[PDB]
Amino acid sequence: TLSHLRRTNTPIAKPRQLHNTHWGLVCPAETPEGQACGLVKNL
Amino acid sequence: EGLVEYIDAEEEESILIAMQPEDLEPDVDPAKRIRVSHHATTFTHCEIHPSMILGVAASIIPFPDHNQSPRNTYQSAMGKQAMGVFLTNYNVRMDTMANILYYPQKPLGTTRAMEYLKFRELPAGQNAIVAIACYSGY
Amino acid sequence: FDMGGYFIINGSEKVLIAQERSAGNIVQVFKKAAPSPISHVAEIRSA
Amino acid sequence: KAIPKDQRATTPYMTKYERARILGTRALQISMNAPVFVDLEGETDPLRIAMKELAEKKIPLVIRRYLPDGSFEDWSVEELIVDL
Amino acid sequence: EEGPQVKIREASKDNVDFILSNVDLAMANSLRRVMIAEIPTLAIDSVEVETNTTVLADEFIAHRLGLIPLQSMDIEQLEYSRDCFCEDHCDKCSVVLTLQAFGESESTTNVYSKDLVIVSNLMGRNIGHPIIQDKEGNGVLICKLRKGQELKLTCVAKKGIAKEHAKWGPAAAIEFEYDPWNKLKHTDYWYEQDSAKEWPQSKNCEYEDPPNEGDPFDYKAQADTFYMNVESVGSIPVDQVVVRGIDTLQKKVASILLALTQM
Amino acid sequence: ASRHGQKGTIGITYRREDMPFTAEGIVPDLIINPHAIPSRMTVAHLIECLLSKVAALSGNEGDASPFTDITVEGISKLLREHGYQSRGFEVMYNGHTGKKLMAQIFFGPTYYQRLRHMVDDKIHARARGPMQVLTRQPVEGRSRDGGLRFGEMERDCMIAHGAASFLKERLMEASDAFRVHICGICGLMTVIAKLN
Amino acid sequence: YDRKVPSPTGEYVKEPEWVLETDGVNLSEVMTVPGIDPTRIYTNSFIDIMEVLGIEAGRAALYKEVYNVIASDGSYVNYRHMALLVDVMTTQGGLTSVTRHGFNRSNTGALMRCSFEETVEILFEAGASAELDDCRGVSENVILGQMAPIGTGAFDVMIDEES
Amino acid sequence: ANWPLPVNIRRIIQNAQQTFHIDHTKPSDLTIKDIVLGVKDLQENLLVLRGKNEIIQNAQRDAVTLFCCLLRSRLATRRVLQEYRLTKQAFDWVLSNIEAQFLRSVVHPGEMVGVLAAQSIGEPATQMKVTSGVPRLKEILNVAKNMKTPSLTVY
Amino acid sequence: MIVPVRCFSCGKVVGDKWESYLNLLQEDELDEGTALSRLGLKRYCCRRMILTHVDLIEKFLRYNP
Amino acid sequence: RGNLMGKRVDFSARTVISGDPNLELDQVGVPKSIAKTLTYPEVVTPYNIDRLTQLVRNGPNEHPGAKYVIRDSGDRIDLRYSKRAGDIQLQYGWKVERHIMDNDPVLFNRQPSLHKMSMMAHRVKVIPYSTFRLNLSVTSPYNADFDGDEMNLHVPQSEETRAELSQLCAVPLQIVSPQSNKPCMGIVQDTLCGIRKLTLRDTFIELDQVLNMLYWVPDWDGVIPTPAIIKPKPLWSGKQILSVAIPNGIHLQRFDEGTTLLSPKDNGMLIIDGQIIFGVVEKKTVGSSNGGLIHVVTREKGPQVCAKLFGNIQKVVNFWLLHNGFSTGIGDTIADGPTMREITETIAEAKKKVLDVTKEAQANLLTAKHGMTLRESFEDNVVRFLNEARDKAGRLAEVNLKDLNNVKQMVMAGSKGSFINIAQMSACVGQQSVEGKRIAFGFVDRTLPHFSKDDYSPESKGFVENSYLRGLTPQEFFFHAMGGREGLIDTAVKTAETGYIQRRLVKALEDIMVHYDNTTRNSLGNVIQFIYGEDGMDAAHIEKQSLDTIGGSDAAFEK
Amino acid sequence: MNAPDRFELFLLGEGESKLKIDPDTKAPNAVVITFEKEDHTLGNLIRAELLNDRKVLFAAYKVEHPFFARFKLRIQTTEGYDPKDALKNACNSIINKLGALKTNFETEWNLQTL
Amino acid sequence: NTLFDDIFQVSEVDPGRYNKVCRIEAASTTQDQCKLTLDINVELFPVAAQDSLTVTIASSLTRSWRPPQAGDRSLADDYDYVMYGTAYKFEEVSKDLIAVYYSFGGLLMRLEGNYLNNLKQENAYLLIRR
RNA sequence: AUGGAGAGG
Numbered sequence A: 001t002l003s004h005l006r007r008t009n010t011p012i013a014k015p016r017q018l019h020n021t022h023w024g025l026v027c028p029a030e031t032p033e034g035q036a037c038g039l040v041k042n043l
Numbered sequence B: 001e002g003l004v005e006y007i008d009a010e011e012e013e014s015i016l017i018a019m020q021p022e023d024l025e026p027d028v029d030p031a032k033r034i035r036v037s038h039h040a041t042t043f044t045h046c047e048i049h050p051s052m053i054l055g056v057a058a059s060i061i062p063f064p065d066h067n068q069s070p071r072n073t074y075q076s077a078m079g080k081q082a083m084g085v086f087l088t089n090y091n092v093r094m095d096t097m098a099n100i101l102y103y104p105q106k107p108l109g110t111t112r113a114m115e116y117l118k119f120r121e122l123p124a125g126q127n128a129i130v131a132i133a134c135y136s137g138y
Numbered sequence C: 001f002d003m004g005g006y007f008i009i010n011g012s013e014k015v016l017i018a019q020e021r022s023a024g025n026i027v028q029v030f031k032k033a034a035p036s037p038i039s040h041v042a043e044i045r046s047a
Numbered sequence D: 001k002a003i004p005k006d007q008r009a010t011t012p013y014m015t016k017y018e019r020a021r022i023l024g025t026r027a028l029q030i031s032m033n034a035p036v037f038v039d040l041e042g043e044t045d046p047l048r049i050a051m052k053e054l055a056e057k058k059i060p061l062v063i064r065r066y067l068p069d070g071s072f073e074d075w076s077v078e079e080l081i082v083d084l
Numbered sequence E: 001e002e003g004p005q006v007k008i009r010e011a012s013k014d015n016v017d018f019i020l021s022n023v024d025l026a027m028a029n030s031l032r033r034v035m036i037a038e039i040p041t042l043a044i045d046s047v048e049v050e051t052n053t054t055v056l057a058d059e060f061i062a063h064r065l066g067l068i069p070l071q072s073m074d075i076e077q078l079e080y081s082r083d084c085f086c087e088d089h090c091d092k093c094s095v096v097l098t099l100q101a102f103g104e105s106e107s108t109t110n111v112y113s114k115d116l117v118i119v120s121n122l123m124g125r126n127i128g129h130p131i132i133q134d135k136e137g138n139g140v141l142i143c144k145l146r147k148g149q150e151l152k153l154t155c156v157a158k159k160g161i162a163k164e165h166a167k168w169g170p171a172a173a174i175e176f177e178y179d180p181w182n183k184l185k186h187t188d189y190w191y192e193q194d195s196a197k198e199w200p201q202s203k204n205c206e207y208e209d210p211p212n213e214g215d216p217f218d219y220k221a222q223a224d225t226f227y228m229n230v231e232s233v234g235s236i237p238v239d240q241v242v243v244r245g246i247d248t249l250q251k252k253v254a255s256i257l258l259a260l261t262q263m
Numbered sequence F: 001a002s003r004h005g006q007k008g009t010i011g012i013t014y015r016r017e018d019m020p021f022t023a024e025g026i027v028p029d030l031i032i033n034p035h036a037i038p039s040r041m042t043v044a045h046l047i048e049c050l051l052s053k054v055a056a057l058s059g060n061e062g063d064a065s066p067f068t069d070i071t072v073e074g075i076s077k078l079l080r081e082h083g084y085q086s087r088g089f090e091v092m093y094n095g096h097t098g099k100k101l102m103a104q105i106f107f108g109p110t111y112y113q114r115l116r117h118m119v120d121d122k123i124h125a126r127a128r129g130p131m132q133v134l135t136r137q138p139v140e141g142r143s144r145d146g147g148l149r150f151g152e153m154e155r156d157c158m159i160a161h162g163a164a165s166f167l168k169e170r171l172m173e174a175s176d177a178f179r180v181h182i183c184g185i186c187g188l189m190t191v192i193a194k195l196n
Numbered sequence G: 001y002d003r004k005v006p007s008p009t010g011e012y013v014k015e016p017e018w019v020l021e022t023d024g025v026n027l028s029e030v031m032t033v034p035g036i037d038p039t040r041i042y043t044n045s046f047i048d049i050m051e052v053l054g055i056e057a058g059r060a061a062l063y064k065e066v067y068n069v070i071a072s073d074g075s076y077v078n079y080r081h082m083a084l085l086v087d088v089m090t091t092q093g094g095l096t097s098v099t100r101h102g103f104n105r106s107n108t109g110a111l112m113r114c115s116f117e118e119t120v121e122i123l124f125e126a127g128a129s130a131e132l133d134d135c136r137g138v139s140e141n142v143i144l145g146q147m148a149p150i151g152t153g154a155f156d157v158m159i160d161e162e163s
Numbered sequence H: 001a002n003w004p005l006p007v008n009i010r011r012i013i014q015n016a017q018q019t020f021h022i023d024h025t026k027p028s029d030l031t032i033k034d035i036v037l038g039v040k041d042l043q044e045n046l047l048v049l050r051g052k053n054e055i056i057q058n059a060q061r062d063a064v065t066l067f068c069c070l071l072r073s074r075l076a077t078r079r080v081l082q083e084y085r086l087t088k089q090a091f092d093w094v095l096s097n098i099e100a101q102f103l104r105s106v107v108h109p110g111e112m113v114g115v116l117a118a119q120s121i122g123e124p125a126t127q128m129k130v131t132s133g134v135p136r137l138k139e140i141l142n143v144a145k146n147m148k149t150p151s152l153t154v155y
Numbered sequence I: 001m002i003v004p005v006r007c008f009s010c011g012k013v014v015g016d017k018w019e020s021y022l023n024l025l026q027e028d029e030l031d032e033g034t035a036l037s038r039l040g041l042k043r044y045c046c047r048r049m050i051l052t053h054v055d056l057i058e059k060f061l062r063y064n065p
Numbered sequence J: 001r002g003n004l005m006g007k008r009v010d011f012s013a014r015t016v017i018s019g020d021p022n023l024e025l026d027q028v029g030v031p032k033s034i035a036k037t038l039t040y041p042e043v044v045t046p047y048n049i050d051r052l053t054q055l056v057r058n059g060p061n062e063h064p065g066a067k068y069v070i071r072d073s074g075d076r077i078d079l080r081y082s083k084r085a086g087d088i089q090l091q092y093g094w095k096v097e098r099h100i101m102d103n104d105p106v107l108f109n110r111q112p113s114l115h116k117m118s119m120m121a122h123r124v125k126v127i128p129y130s131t132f133r134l135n136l137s138v139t140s141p142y143n144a145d146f147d148g149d150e151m152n153l154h155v156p157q158s159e160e161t162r163a164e165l166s167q168l169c170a171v172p173l174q175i176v177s178p179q180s181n182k183p184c185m186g187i188v189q190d191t192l193c194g195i196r197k198l199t200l201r202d203t204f205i206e207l208d209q210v211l212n213m214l215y216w217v218p219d220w221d222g223v224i225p226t227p228a229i230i231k232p233k234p235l236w237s238g239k240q241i242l243s244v245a246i247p248n249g250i251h252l253q254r255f256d257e258g259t260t261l262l263s264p265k266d267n268g269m270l271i272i273d274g275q276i277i278f279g280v281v282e283k284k285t286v287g288s289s290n291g292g293l294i295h296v297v298t299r300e301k302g303p304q305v306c307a308k309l310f311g312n313i314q315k316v317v318n319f320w321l322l323h324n325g326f327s328t329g330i331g332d333t334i335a336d337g338p339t340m341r342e343i344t345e346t347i348a349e350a351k352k353k354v355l356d357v358t359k360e361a362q363a364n365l366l367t368a369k370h371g372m373t374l375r376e377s378f379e380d381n382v383v384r385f386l387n388e389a390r391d392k393a394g395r396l397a398e399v400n401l402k403d404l405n406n407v408k409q410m411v412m413a414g415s416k417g418s419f420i421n422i423a424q425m426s427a428c429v430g431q432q433s434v435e436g437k438r439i440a441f442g443f444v445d446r447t448l449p450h451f452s453k454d455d456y457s458p459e460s461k462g463f464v465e466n467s468y469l470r471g472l473t474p475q476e477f478f479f480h481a482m483g484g485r486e487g488l489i490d491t492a493v494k495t496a497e498t499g500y501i502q503r504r505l506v507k508a509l510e511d512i513m514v515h516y517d518n519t520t521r522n523s524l525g526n527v528i529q530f531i532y533g534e535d536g537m538d539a540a541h542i543e544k545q546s547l548d549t550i551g552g553s554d555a556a557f558e559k
Numbered sequence K: 001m002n003a004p005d006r007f008e009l010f011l012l013g014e015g016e017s018k019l020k021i022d023p024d025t026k027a028p029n030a031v032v033i034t035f036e037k038e039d040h041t042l043g044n045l046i047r048a049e050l051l052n053d054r055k056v057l058f059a060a061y062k063v064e065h066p067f068f069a070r071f072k073l074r075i076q077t078t079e080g081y082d083p084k085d086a087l088k089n090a091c092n093s094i095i096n097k098l099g100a101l102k103t104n105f106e107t108e109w110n111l112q113t114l
Numbered sequence L: 001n002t003l004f005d006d007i008f009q010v011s012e013v014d015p016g017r018y019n020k021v022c023r024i025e026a027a028s029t030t031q032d033q034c035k036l037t038l039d040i041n042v043e044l045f046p047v048a049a050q051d052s053l054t055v056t057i058a059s060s061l062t063r064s065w066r067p068p069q070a071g072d073r074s075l076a077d078d079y080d081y082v083m084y085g086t087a088y089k090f091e092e093v094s095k096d097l098i099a100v101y102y103s104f105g106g107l108l109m110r111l112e113g114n115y116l117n118n119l120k121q122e123n124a125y126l127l128i129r130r
Numbered sequence M: 001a002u003g004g005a006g007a008g009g
Ligand SMILES: [Mg+2]
Pocket: J144, J145, J146, J147, J148, J149, M009
């Protein structure tokens, strides 16, 4: 529940890669696997 | 009182963040990890705690810095599939499907982040006496 | 322990997922491809 | 037209597909209680009976091997060599 | 006597620590296995719930009800429900005990195992009574009731084997160790530097003689001296646990022999 | 699954007799294979096992926080202070025979979590059942008592094997099969087959 | 590059030569340069080999490249398979791609080509050109729900009175 | 030297000096004609194609050329008589067994080897300074006009 | 939920030791270790059964129904 | 594509899979409920009228039973509802839909079906519990573990098609694959580590255990082999008792490194007449290699004998390992003190070298390599130095490990493990990389806000000194997270593109086969190859042999 | 769901006998006996007590599958010695040893305190 | 009967990463053209350096291995360390130097002599005393 | 049935 209440979606160069600016803002590990990997992120 | 600031990435672009509050002060144990000496001086901000870079599901992982990152990812994706007490009022709610563990237990190896996630109060699993061994081959 | 932050529609608990987008009113210059006639494009999304 | 019994260039050995086909068809015949041409000797499974009936070459079937041009060569099960 | 020997080192109502002398490994291990599982015990097998307005679910309570340690002293003069010619269950195979509880005070009204009331006829047989090793005298905590919560049910206990379900377990954990000096070399010790300094020293090393470096490996040696510690749950006394174990193993061996006589 | 991405299903269940046991008489609630360790490099599994063991013995709460100076050496020392092997190994006995095991076993408490997926909610079997109304093929879904899709890749496999008759059976007798009448002139399904 | 070369005494001995690697490709003019061996010159671009040296050289180069890709991961596939792929890619006369633009423009059955990529338009143009279907294709008999003339179904079974 | 060839010969040879229990201190009961003409007639029965016209025969010899090279290399008179010392019966058994295994190693007509090849190439691709691996394979199969890393190897 | 009646691993009764555990904790002001030691929980599995457990029935009894 | 090229079928099932060391290779563990559900039509014959009558008499719910009874007219008798489910006189010609029983041929399959080994015919063995059970030596061509994997099972409906499965899609036939001209099945996991731990020269087994292992073999002749040790204690060896599983007439020979018919390191592999002479048996032998034992046994004794061999080896090895024991802890990831010191100073001199090269490049004294930038040459040098550092520390950690090290044992056995695992768990996990390059500058002239601008130092650009044992730092953890992220992404992209490409390849080479003239053609009769494989041989019956005519001097050749 | 009953581990089924004595066709003068509803607890003990007899050539037991509570026991004795007699002698030896052990433990327990 | 008999002088002992089996290297005290390499179970029969062991090769003292009964049947040894193996290779160094290779369940053995009745046979009883 | 979300290898 906690995880689903803090989720980020992204529609559509490398938006899937964990960018450096994600430090302290987005969780590096928590992300769906298979399809929407990197697109769907958690705070 | 001007003790803590709110910094976004755009403003984060122009600051120097200290990883630990002990990196402001100016023979060793071989067991501990090798950490780089602070070659920086003009610090403007200091990190609250490096364990805050993780998320809610990833904060349940014991020693995440001792694992391979995709394994931490897998655990972060499988922690949402574990059974336990999701709500205290589970007996008065009419959910389509709900699973509640018979005897939930707070892990023997916890995280200081679990305190704020209320995981020790509402755990999702049990401490099982595990054995790493080749037995019957099953 | 319920933290809230969700809605209730027809008895179903709904959650609005944050939608990521590009920040408007920001000037960005992009290098165009080689087969393209234009070499650089400075664009800005006005909101 | 056809191809004479002589000058047949196809493999004298029975292919695995031909063997599986013959055994399958014969087992189908036995499954529908067809006259057995060999001593059962306890065997009741139509496939196994078909195999034992193949080892004794007591199978009255024939194989029409098609050539890509349209021609075809006939090979009786009794004539084909089963080395598999 | 004439064969195997026992040397009791410690003894209590809950534990027995002893040394088994002149025995084969298979016999000792089999004795352990029998003591763990194949000992007959009495425990709640049936639960008839009338009114259940507490927090816990029905079978959730029935579970811990079944796990409750009951008296199994005279369990041998009781009979299996599958052997008795009675319909369902009777007094010659099962022990019926009721459970009635209700919140009265404003405070949380606890429900223990002391509230279990034997209803069926015991006819002299010491059986059915829930074991209470508790200091206050309460025993196994069943559940907790609020102010207006009620729990009314009826338990039927039957004779069973721990091999069928762990609730019929007469013993907890049985300590077992042979050859504390590894003089038989049944174990290749893992190490980083020193195999002796890293691995702790067992208590049972005081009863045997330390190996001499001037002596070669004794290849003709076998496992004779064993060290055991049997712990009882409370249902059956420790000495009676190991005795019923021995008698059980002996009895099933005698049953196989009987089958040999039959064929 | 554990807490380090080490997931897996139950292979079999053994009673406390058949289970391997330590000298203390303690039997493992769970047995995992060592092969699921080196290829995945989940050291923190072993570390959290050691820490959970020490925290179990000392009765304290093991701190498994991310970036701390708590090392395996300190935990090993704390474990040795309780009279156990500092590296978590325990000499166990084979439950079937009672004989010692040559190699010692990494033995200790580890927080496992029963996941969502269960066999009785996954198992499915259909010899024959309800068809669709448009294609007259077996419906979709376990909850609808449907059949499994014999995908194109499976067809390719059966082609590779050479089992033509089987491929025909799966695509006729197994799924849909229709008897149609065709005109000998135009060659279409115009025929008004008045049977009987 | 190191190289195994037959010694005048007999045995193969390592003889190291100098080889010029190159970013940039124009085989049509590099091989004609005086100074290097114009019989051993090679490019990773088989599309240039097909233009300069011929269709067979393009075949060998294609197989070489595919095999290099497969073996790059340490894997190993037998010769006949990759050779079959390359051959089916080179039997038309040129380099036929493995897409809708390549082999899907062949003179095979309509049902076969309609079971891949462009389905509707293929059926349309086939219905317009009035094409006859051989019905000896796999996917075609698959659609027809018949025992395809493949493997076990490659032949027919009859009966001859020998009893 | 190491190459994939249909019939194994070494395992047959070492199976001949075991099934007959031959001693390495006893003269072979063979003749030069036996070995030479025997092997030379052995290559006659190694049939892949079975036509009677010249073309099919040429394709035949061309198809069994390499295995014939291996056969001659392994069944040389010097090697046969000295390296392992084979008797008459053992040699004949070797010949017959080699012929048999050769006739077994022939591809069976009807073998859908197209799909088999496609699978044999597609399957390892799942387990995957120029461009290599999956993208390069994609370039190859698509026959790309522009490849990401064109190279010129000049000797 | 509520304190488990018996230990999972071995099978030792630990249901009558919960309130005694709490009393050994808050009344005598001892740590968890000594508290679990005095209750006769020598094996760390039985010790785990109480140390690891969380009594959730108290939060459950807060509701009126 | 959805209804014609691949449509949903009846007589099928799907369940979670699991392993079973006591099942044969060509067997499958089918749950009882699935056995009652799935059915097969069997025509009433004088050979099986009794058994069929009994099956009908049992009806549904009870296995072995039947579901429906088809008469002459075609009427379907539902046994679970019929008033006459107790009195049925089976006439000849009637069909009886009975439950799936033992030794029945079914098609086992797991998606994605990449090759023909993904679909293989198995024999049914009805077992309790709701899990599909399979052998541990069939898990490799199916490519499956037991982390919740599900597999599909199809059931044939006629005699010719079950014959088609039993004679073509049979597992023992699919041992040697026509893909890499090698067996695609072998001994793995506990059986491999165990067969490694057993064939050691220090491994001696006494009388009783030897007798048990001997009886564990179904093909055991009942003859006690004379022990390698007569006095003082009658002892056997692992090799000696393992030879019981190996059939007679099996000759295996393999020389590796310093194998001189005596093997001081007990390497190589010599087995004579079904009896192993010397050498430790592991992945190079009992594995799925080209010249492996499995390939030899299969091509010599046959497929059935080879599968039975899988059975025997698995049973024996698993039995010995069961009463021996094997584990793995953190202790097998810890190196010695001075070793860790040498590793640390190795990383130190590495970073020192990187510092020297950096200061050199910043002094504009660096000379660019021909065909690349100064910066590119710099990055290349640094990356190469860090890689050499990770390899140096890794080998330094591997040498320190003992033979009793469990992880090192699993590496030697070939069960599961490699050098890099040891290197990262104990020594150093090394440099992280994204898109071929080290951690770039997400921020302006820097990778993280914790660093200063223009910091091309290794620890900044994504080098991790610490191992998994010591624990990573925040920066190192984030960089490693980036690397792993890219890993997962490019993995998904990889399997997607590979899927589509595989489909394309399949649809391209679909209608290609070999006719009765060894001519590889298509549907148009167009010749692809005049002779298949340019030789006319099947890829299955082909082994890599040495042409000893091409090598050696002319003098040795003439000699 | 598909899980078998628990009593199937110690309660014999319909028509199932306790022992199934079959002539071993491998080596002469041998026997394979199928024990039903019994596990390692009995098999290991019997097998261990069959090796004490010096007139017994072979003695081994095995559980072909942990799912089913049953095990096979192969015994081979010298010529003139029926293996069933060896089995019975071993069993009686077990019984005697267990009885003596029980007596000893009782006499020991009758001297303890607390 | 007996196939070979000689007295050797242990010149080297090597525990190659083992702890139960050590490879021995000895030479004949009679023939200056004879040598022997032999894997030995030290855990049973310890072989120190500079020892003079008595070595013998026999063919007897197939059927299944019956129980010992050494004090009842014909043991025909009274040695200290007896093994059973199988010859697998007959190597000829020179015309005056012939070496044989025995395999005792993995414990290999290389015996180099000159003058032999050691034929390729399963019979290989190696008896060592003192 | 259409459409959509999430999850499993
Ligand atoms: Mg998986």
